[model samples]
Target: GSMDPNALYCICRQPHNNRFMICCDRCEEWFHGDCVGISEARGRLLERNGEDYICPNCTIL
Candidate 1:
């Protein structure tokens, strides 16, 4: 399934707090929060927690 291009989610430097992110309905595939310059603290947290690190496009694939 493909992600809705119209859907918008906040991209943040820190996942726990609102910092910054791109909004879109289409899912991003080859990029991640860290990929786009997210903070190490937040990135590590997500990785350690074993969360889904894929973007919308990646999820569809």
Candidate 2:
């Protein structure tokens, strides 16, 4: 069966709960903070900065 269109999944390919999530500046994929080794507070801090937030994979290139 096809999944619901409204379902939200992260970079880890897991469904989103009440946890914080951030979008990659390059690929624009939604990733949970925890999955990306970033805490909610840390994510917020990064968002506050006037800079782009690239994921680890994107950074490697």
Error of 2 at 51 (Å): 1.9
Cand. 1 TM to true fold: 0.30
Per-residue CA lDDT of model 1 for 1-58, tens digit only, reads: 3434443343422332333333223453223354455555765676687665545443
TM-score, each model?
Answer: 0.30, 0.67
Over the full model, what C-alpha lDDT does candidate 1 score relative to the true structure?
Answer: 0.44
RMSD of 2: 4.8
Q: Once model 1 is optimally superposed onto the true structure by TM-score, how far is the C-alpha of residue 18 displaced, in angstroms?
A: 26
Model 1, position 15: C-alpha lDDT score:
39
lDDT of 2 by residue, 17-55 (tens): 556777777876667787778788888888798567777
Which regions of candidate 1 fall more than 4 Å away from where they truly are? 1-35, 55-61
